[PDB]
Amino acid sequence: MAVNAVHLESDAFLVCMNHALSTEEVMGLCIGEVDTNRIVHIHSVIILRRVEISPEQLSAASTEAERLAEMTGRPMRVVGWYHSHPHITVWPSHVDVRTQAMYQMMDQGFVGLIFSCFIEDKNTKTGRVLYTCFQSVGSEYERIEIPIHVV
Amino acid sequence: MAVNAVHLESDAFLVCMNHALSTEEVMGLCIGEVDTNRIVHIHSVIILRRVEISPEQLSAASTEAERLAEMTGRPMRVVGWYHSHPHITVWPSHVDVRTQAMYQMMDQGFVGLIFSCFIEDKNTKTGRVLYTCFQSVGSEYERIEIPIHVV
Ligand SMILES: [Zn+2]
Ligand SMILES: [Zn+2]
């Protein structure tokens, strides 16, 4: 079992929350660290528009990794990826599962993260936001949920 | 200081050594882990032919990351990149420094690794192989050597 849990610091949570409400095609970059107990600490999340990473994406990631490392004193890095599900259920689409899968070909403890304000019940007057953390598992891959906590 | 030292297990060393002798354009992928003391453990190295990673490169990396994690029990990942300097000095070319620099925009503790059997003295009868570990540091980037040990 690669990752036991994911500790998401409250500020990075609020960022994902704010974009989950956007309700509009982008993807986020989770930045933080991993400790002895296979726990992924996410201190910040940056949201921007085979495996390829644009120089625009690199500079944004590096800038926050600098700001975080300068704050904490510890070295930071990209540990996960975020995107929103405003028009579908919070669960990872089969594309997300196959995407996360090839991400794990590099970090193996890499993490998939999804927020969703979507509600199919069109008669309820009650607000809802879901957030799940997932990975991937011959033959096809499938979702495996990772416990996620907020600090 | 992102990384204190690099612990390179003896078998991964021999691999880099074997290709350093090839004397012939490829690049290697260092696979391992990082611990509390900012030490990069490299358990294996795979050598194959903006930031882009081919699906051919991904499958190779994942396969060894599986084999290592199955052996050690701990989760593995890509921690560095290797290439040989058979026709130049062991020191990182300015391209290597700029390459390593944008690698660090993702991992920050990511490591550059170079082996070299090159000897400019054409009158000496004595064999030599150098290996250095480096990173990158507004304005231009420059080489910063990382201590490297073999297990
Ligand atoms: Zn999706
Ligand atoms: Zn070079």
Pairing assessment for the beta strands B39-48 and B27-34 based on DSSP bridges: antiparallel
Helix segments in chain A, DSSP class H: 10-20, 55-72, 94-103
**What one-letter code names the amino acid at A120?**
E
Distance CA B9, CA B31 (A): 11
- CA atoms of B109 and A43, how far apart (whole Å): 17
Tokens 């919070």 — which residue?
A90
Cβ contact A77–B107 (<8 Å): yes
Q: At which residue do the structure tokens 């700001």 appear?
A: A67
The sign of the torsion formed by the CA atoms of B84, B95, B89, B137 equals negative
**Which residues lie below 8 Å from residue A128, measured CB to CB, with a gap of 6+?**
A117, A119
Q: Assess contact for A48 and A89: CB atoms under 8 A.
A: no
3-class DSSP state of B132 = strand
Q: A107 is written with which tokens?
A: 């970090």
CB contact under 8 A, A78 and B107: yes
- Domains in chain B (CATH in brackets) are 1-151 (3.40.140.10)
Best CA proximity match to B80, nearest among B62, B100, B66 = B100
The experimental resolution of this structure, in angstroms, equals: 3.2
Residue B77 and residue A108 in contact, taking contact as beta carbons nearer than 8 Å: yes
What SS3 state is found at B88? coil
Tell me how the structure was determined: X-ray
Q: Which residues of A touch B69 (CB under 8 A)?
A: 2, 108
Are A53 and B2 inside 8 Å of each other by CB? no
The residue among B39, B52, B116 whose CA lies nearest residue B79 is B39
